[PDB]
Write a protein that binds this DNA or RNA. Structure first.
Length: 134
RNA sequence: AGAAAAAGAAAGACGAAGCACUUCUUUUUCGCCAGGUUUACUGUAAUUGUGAAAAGGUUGGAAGAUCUGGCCAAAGAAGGU
């Protein structure tokens, strides 16, 4: 950060967050806000990704839903990808059991991509059927 | 694979500026097949038909011969009168 490293500093922040920086139900958002400006919308998406990893505040399901809604609204590739993926992982808002055919298929029909990111994660944890059709 | 993050892109209806501001809701990226859905028609093989050039006197059956003298040649390859 004294090397003014927007990039390398957000890098180290994701690094330590994965390397077990505290979560503490507040340390999550603490490190995330610390990383959020970092001259990079991608850096804020990386903060949100390390956040979804450290599931302290990530258990706010509709909150991850709204954050990723604004993200995939603004067309943030890294944000939509990491957020929605680890969201479906921590059972946050990416699908359902009665509106999953809408939710997941709409994350794909968002735009032309995050379809391949579903193939990265979300299609893997599809769970949009217990069948073979979907 | 070992565990040692990853790396991506379309239109339509809705508010708005009479479009774009993006926010919700569906849309497709050929292994090799096969008609077709009209082509912006224009530069880039060729066939066949066309494809130029003045007159006079002489002998002879008849001139292309002859004497006098002009014209074409990217045609003086040839073939008949």
């Amino acid at each position: 950060a004294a090397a003014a490293a927007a990039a390398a500093a957000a890098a180290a922040a994701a690094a330590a967050a994965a390397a077990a920086a505290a979560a503490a139900a507040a340390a999550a958002a603490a490190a995330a806000a610390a990383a959020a400006a970092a001259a990079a919308a991608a850096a804020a998406a990386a903060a949100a990704a390390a956040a979804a990893a450290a599931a302290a505040a990530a258990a706010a399901a509709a909150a991850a839903a709204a954050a990723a809604a604004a993200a995939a609204a603004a067309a943030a590739a890294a944000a939509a990808a990491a957020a929605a993926a680890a969201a479906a992982a921590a059972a946050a808002a990416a699908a359902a059991a009665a509106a999953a055919a809408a939710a997941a298929a709409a994350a794909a029909a968002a735009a032309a991509a995050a379809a391949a990111a579903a193939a990265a994660a979300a299609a893997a944890a599809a769970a949009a059927a217990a069948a073979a059709a979907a």
